[PDB]
Amino acid sequence: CGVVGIYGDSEASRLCYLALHALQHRGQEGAGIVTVSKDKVLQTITGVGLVSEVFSESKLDQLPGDIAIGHVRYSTAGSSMLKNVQPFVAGYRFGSVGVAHNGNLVNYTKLRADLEENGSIFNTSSDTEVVLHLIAISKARPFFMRIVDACEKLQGAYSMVFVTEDKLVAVRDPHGFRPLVMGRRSNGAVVFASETCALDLIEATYEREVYPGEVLVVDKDGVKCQCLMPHPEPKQCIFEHIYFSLPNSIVFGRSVYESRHVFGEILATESPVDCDVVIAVPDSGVVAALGYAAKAGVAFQQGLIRSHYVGRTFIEPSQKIRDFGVKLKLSPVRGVLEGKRVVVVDDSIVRGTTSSKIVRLLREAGAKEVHMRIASPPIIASCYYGVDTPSSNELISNRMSVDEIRDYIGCDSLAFLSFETLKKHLGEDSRSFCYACFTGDYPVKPTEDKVKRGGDFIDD
Amino acid sequence: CGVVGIYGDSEASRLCYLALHALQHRGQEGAGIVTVSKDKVLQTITGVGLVSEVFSESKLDQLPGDIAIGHVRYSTAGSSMLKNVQPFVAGYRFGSVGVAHNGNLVNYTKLRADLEENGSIFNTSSDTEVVLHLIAISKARPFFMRIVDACEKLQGAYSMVFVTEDKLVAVRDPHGFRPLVMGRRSNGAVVFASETCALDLIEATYEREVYPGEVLVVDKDGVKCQCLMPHPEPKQCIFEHIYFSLPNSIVFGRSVYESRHVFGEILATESPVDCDVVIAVPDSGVVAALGYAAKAGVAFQQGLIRSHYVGRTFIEPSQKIRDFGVKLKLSPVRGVLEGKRVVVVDDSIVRGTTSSKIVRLLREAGAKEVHMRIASPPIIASCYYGVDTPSSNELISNRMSVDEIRDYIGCDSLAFLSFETLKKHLGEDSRSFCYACFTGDYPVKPTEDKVKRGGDFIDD
Amino acid sequence: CGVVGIYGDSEASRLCYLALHALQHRGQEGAGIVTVSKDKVLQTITGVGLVSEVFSESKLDQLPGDIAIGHVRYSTAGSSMLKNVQPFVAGYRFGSVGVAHNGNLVNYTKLRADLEENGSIFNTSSDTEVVLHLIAISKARPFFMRIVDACEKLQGAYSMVFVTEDKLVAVRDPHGFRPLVMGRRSNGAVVFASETCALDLIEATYEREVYPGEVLVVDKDGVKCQCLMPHPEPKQCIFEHIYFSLPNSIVFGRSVYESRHVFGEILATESPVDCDVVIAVPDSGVVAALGYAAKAGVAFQQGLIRSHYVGRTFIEPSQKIRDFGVKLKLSPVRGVLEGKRVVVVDDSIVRGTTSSKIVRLLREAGAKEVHMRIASPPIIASCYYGVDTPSSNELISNRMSVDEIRDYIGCDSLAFLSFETLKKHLGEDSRSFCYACFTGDYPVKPTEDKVKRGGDFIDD
Amino acid sequence: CGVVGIYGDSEASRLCYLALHALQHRGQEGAGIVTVSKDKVLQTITGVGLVSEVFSESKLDQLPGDIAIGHVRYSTAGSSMLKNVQPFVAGYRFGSVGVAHNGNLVNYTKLRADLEENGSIFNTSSDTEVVLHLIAISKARPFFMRIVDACEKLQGAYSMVFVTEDKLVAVRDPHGFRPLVMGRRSNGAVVFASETCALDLIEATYEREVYPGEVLVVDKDGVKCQCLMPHPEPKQCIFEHIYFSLPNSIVFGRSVYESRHVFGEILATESPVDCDVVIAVPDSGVVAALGYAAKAGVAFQQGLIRSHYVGRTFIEPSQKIRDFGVKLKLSPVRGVLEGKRVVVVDDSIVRGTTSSKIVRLLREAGAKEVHMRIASPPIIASCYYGVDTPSSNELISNRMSVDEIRDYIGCDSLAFLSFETLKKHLGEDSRSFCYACFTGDYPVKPTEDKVKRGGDFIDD
Ligand code: SF4
Ligand code: SF4
Ligand code: SF4
Ligand code: SF4
């Protein structure tokens, strides 16, 4: 998912909408904005669909004010989602507060059961309602002290933005699992975003990361760090660099473009093969493939073309056209592929069902050989920190060998990025990253049965 | 507002939709349904607008199950409503529960402040969330005992339907302020509705009123009254008969058609005037006007015609046409009015602004005289029991005399229904009705500053 | 169908929209407007659905100008209509012209075949495209002379409004089959409409009928009758008074309210029966029923209530609820009907399927007897003049006797309005009306196989 | 624009929808389909917007049949388009016919004036209605002979597909200005499309080009060439290869991918400059830039990223952010640009306004130098053959020098593709291509004042 906050700008809702648009890749199932009116009321509008499908200019017009947070939401309920109320808003003894969260509370069920034992009710099963509940039972003042009280009980990943009647506060969990960054507009306006690309769009100059364990709060006085909670060696999600963030972004202080380009280079040195063309699975693996092509010394060619007009809800012929889902967004250039030995670069392999479709598509297009190259180590464990992966037995690198996956998807060779060379490339910062999906060893371990943060607002 | 519940029918969502349609007059600002899937999960879909604007056949298809409750909501936020989340659903230690409510908790702010003092948060400012909170902090079992526990702390009006993973329960407050009735379908299906007309549509035979102070619960065993909470002398809302319900309805055991027809008769005996025509303000006052015409001995004529295609949002010429809102739904028949002395019957006068528009419309249409007759006593005090009236100083009968209102709206005579003759017509049951809007004396008095239940899910 | 035209008003599109709304009863399948920009271009927007479903304030904004015509369209394709392009616009040697038509060209197929023989193509099968074709092959000048040339070849009914780059012209066929009336606004604005009620809404004072055979043209000079084409004794459609127009209207110089009230009176004198209540089928037959109740000396009671929220596309339970279409818009008042002998008044009986449903509905509501009274003579022949009736063998008065229809619909008695007493009530003007649907004798007879003017813009 | 036809498939409308989707780049302003029902009626549904915005599964369901043509339209009226009625359908003496056209009739106004002189009317100002008119006045039989008769009067570009009650015919004008290609499905189904990519999607194997001057007709007998009209030396649009078609396409027998890659190579040999990075303006110039990077020997990097979620209607901050239109779809990777000398490749320059925006965007992103390279010769003359270019004085290469454009857009160097080296690369086929937009010399010259085919169905 993705979060956004703006303090001190008369177009807070519009700028929040734009930054949510710039982060749309982080979550397509839902969107929402919460803005503080000049009379200090939290107006919220929230729906299922894309940021543009949820917000019209008519609706942005119903959100006047100087402060706003915004959330963009991923969900395996896909388009069959019934309700979405994130950013979550509530009222309690100290006023009104809304929160937008990106992450996953590992100890959600224990926290919820303990709160339920004293009569708490839950409108949604989302972590952010547990965060608000914890803040509410806190007896400390001011608001940031209650945020501190609440966060000390949370295990897991969280990057959050809170909005109140006159404050905007950003929180990054002590491990720093999830990206959060701060920028400033030409006027005093302060913005937080999940990635720097959202800052770039609305011309908020990137200033710094929000630090792991930090509680930044901006009000009339300005931006002030009012807590650097105790935090160990970091564990920032490596999958942000592998897959989840955009190449223009600078997440965790690194250029995502350079990460993926170097991954491609590593694949080419460490698992070369005679080939005539290097191509990508677009648009993800283009950058990595460029790097592979650079080291391998054979030219990159745009052998597959992503369609501009993909919809994700599309008609299919009655007489079966097999693999229509992919053929509706990937078109092969027969001129580039016919009779050639093709190295096709891609960013990962989880289920393995779509890689098979892509290999078949390339072969039907005239490819003589298809050598697959994955710009990531094999994914063996589930993510417990806020991005949905299937269960551990559904991960094809848990069931099958590398040679077995090679046979299953039907390609001549198959090579993953070596985990050890990844750590070598990171070098000094190799200790600053979570790799649980490649190793199986989690920095924060689940205390009982655990969940993916976003399902649906449908109640058991 | 209006509520509906169905237990024991494989088409629960569809039948709930139809009954909400049959109650659409009770509330046009929002609608919603909650249905229990075969796997015992509470699926809910809820939106702003009419029942047909909120529910498509596609969406009814996402609500399979045997149990469902439904709510249809009134709100002075009109079409500018941002969020509507009623019927309200939540999860707590004993499972999942949804509730639909019609009424008003007089002591909401005290109940909410006391709950806030122990760390409760509130997603909405609606009474029904307070009811769920109270149920949740109850330590009793079973569910109906917690309903009893919660209701003993509520002052005010409430007719509610609760749904859980396998039960449907109906609750009527001890004064019986608000209608609630029960009926049975051909199969075992049990339905509760705010008015009998919803029962009539979906062919659930009317069985009985839910009694004041009753907690009916239907499950696999059947319908069982499991509490008849202590209850004073009833105070059923007389405005259900004056204005709020449909003539086909039998609310509080009486035919609403007969109530309004007799009111018209009373107006004609007790305040006659020489006239040539008796007409109504449609479609509300047609029935009363018929009765007036009968007693007065001059013929009823349909002198105004309501338009079938009223939209409630509508374009207006830029060169202002005066009173375009009424002219867009009421068309006079000049043949019936030209040169005649007209007695025009209507159900009430609150603000008094539209009565003036209607008199002007009749005069422009050729009426020689316009004698206004209101099929209700003068409305002087605000309703504290779940249907929105303006504040007491905004009620024209608080500021002005009967003769003063006559002058302000511009008619030759003006007469209200005598309160004493209303009580005489009720006779034996004259003690069973709330009249606070005609007297000023409330059966349940507000403990502090008090609210109207509808609001908007926009947070202070 | 219904037509509208406005000349000389800067809000021509908005006023056209409003008048089309005021005529919405004439046709619900389509709508459209054509307005002349200040640069003398004919901007047109046209769609399937109601006037409000077709035109948004955003779309009215794309139609600036001083002149506009508008059409509202009936079609047996119902909501399954694929295209609608009426008002029809075209360009030809003398500029650009749009036309909106209400009526039916009896000799359409002959006219179209003769035009096809010289290479004409037809985008639609509508009469109005034939009218434009005929105007175009005319070699006369000015424009009204070409209209005259074209109309002399048309047999049948037509009330039309033409718009050009700077003129608005109204045409009524020599028999005057179809209503057309003219009014003036406060500024110079001149409007034509199918019924006076559309004039009344937008405050254009009714001036006069457009006369049978008249070609009125309004331009910068003003309104001028430039042709009173030869026309015989008129044959104005009696069904406008029986069914098609609104009671507020004055069609053909008569009050439709008085027509229907007198019809009710006639039914009561000429076919009385012992009864306890007189009721109507709402909203059509209320006026007639009032008159019946007046003569019969038993009180009218609103025994059925039309629903305000009828949709015409509505969900129905899977387990069969019989006659759900009617039960979804007509609700009986059991108090008015239980155990009583009911006379129910209605405006016609064509198919006879719905009268049976209504009788059954009344009986289920407790009626002891159901005496049906039809405020119209029996309909035996099809209309050849622009309002769709089923074929002659589908008309129940063609198959069955009066006593046979009585048995088929299941009522105790059944009585139609006597044709001879209808002619007596008309008196002097009894010669001025078409009665072909009651007699079978047509004033203008079809020259070959003939059509209903509106089908679909779907091509054979 | 783009055209599609399918004969002999029970899913003709669905397959037409998919092929129109695969051609969506050819025109975004409108879409439409015409399908022949089993009863031999031409059902058509047609609207403004994208293919997915125009067609729902509900609407495809209303188009059953075995034959269908489809059109996708470009229009400078953009989203402000009022009506789109293409594919055009009509009825005439020999039955019913629909046509979809891509091209431009140079002699439209003369053809239309001559047809107007004999009484023709025109619903639209589109060329395709003139084609239908000409077919209709033909006295020859069969249908293809009338097509031949009509085409002999047309000067200009046209690739058309006609549908009748039982035939599908394809027509390519004698110069072959516009692409049209034929393919076959697994069952007998025959499809025509503007580009091979539409064939590829729905698995119709590419068979051959439709030849310049050809009239192919497919019916029950099969595909038969029934006219190879006299045709000069071809003049196929070079802009199909420069800009208009997709790289997966094989238009005019050549791989568009190879054309653009070679153009990039030519730019690098003939106008080199010291640089550190080669980047493209996505996604258009990626292929050419790849070729440039190959010849120049400096690596390609994806220095700009096109946004996936471009909307073409989009909100903008009220405190103006400059160049928001481009910043909303192109994001620079600062890591790739900061301090580097950038060669940025793009496919053309017409107005020159957006190139300036892009250079500014690159400079703000840290580029030390910006060398622009255009993979096309300078565009000096307007296209008279069916794709909209501004007038000749609006083309920046008409006003300014190459060095002058370099200064105006603000880059260090600027180089266009040499026209002579383009002709050299074409070699044998250099005579088979229209270059009027680079030379000024037209193969077919306008006989009088001339138009762009798209317009809007708004009438003068
Ligand atoms: S388990 Fe994988 S996806 Fe989850 S935080 Fe760790 S590295 Fe990222
Ligand atoms: S105050 Fe009036 S409206 Fe309110 S419950 Fe009492 S009688 Fe009804
Ligand atoms: S046939 Fe009947 S409906 Fe038709 S014009 Fe004559 S009276 Fe009217
Ligand atoms: S003028 Fe240019 S764009 Fe037009 S057809 Fe010729 S080459 Fe193509």
Residue numbers in the entry:
A (entry chain B), B (entry chain A), C (entry chain B), D (entry chain A): 87 to 546
What does the paper say about this structure?
GPRATase catalyzes the first committed step of purine biosynthesis, transforming phosphoribosylpyrophosphate (PRPP) to phosphoribosylamine (PRA) with amide group of glutamine as nitrogen source. The reaction catalyzed by GPRATases is carried out as two half-reactions by two separate domains, in tight allosteric communication between each other. One is the Glnase domain where Gln is hydrolyzed to yield ammonia. And then, the ammonia is transferred through a ~20-Å hydrophobic channel to a distal PRTase domain, in which PRA is synthesized from PRPP and ammonia.
We solved the crystal structure of a recombinant AtGPRAT275-561 without the predicted chloroplast transit peptide at 3.07 Å resolution. However, the PISA (Proteins, Interfaces, Structures and Assemblies) server indicated that AtGPRAT2 exists as a homo-tetramer in crystal as other members of this family. Consistent with this, in the AtGPRAT2 structure, the first residue with interpretable electron density was the predicted N-terminal Cys87, the mutation of which abolished the activity of the enzyme. Structural comparison indicated that AtGPRAT2 adopts an inactive, open conformation as compared to the structures of the EcGPRAT in the presence or absence of the PRPP analog carboxylic PRPP (cPRPP), which represent the active and inactive state, respectively. Nevertheless, the glutamine loop of AtGPRAT2 opens to an extent larger than that of BsGPRAT, and forms a 310 helix. The PRTase flexible loops of AtGPRAT and bacterial enzymes display different open conformations, consistent with the disordered feature of this loop. However, similar as BsGPRAT, AtGPRAT2 does not contain the helix and the corresponding region folds as a flexible loop.
